[PDB]
């Protein structure tokens, strides 16, 4: 399914591909998942994470 994301918590690079750790709206932090970037439709939240990295 498609769900609303609260925040992008982290990013990792594995096998030449980018994945993000996502906090899902209305779900426990125990339900955070790593998702391939192609799954994401949250550009403003990715922009927030990269700026927090600087």
């Amino acid at each position: 399914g498609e769900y609303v994301v609260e925040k992008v918590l982290d990013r990792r690079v594995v096998k030449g591909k980018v994945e993000y750790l996502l906090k899902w709206k209305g779900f426990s932090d125990e339900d955070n998942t790593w998702e391939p970037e192609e799954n994401l439709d949250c550009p403003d939240l990715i922009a927030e994470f990269l700026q927090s990295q600087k």
């Binding site: 498609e2 994301v5 998942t33």
Partner: peptide, 9 residues
Amino acid sequence: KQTARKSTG
């Protein structure tokens, strides 16, 4: 809205 698809399985 900021959404994403959650990988199933």
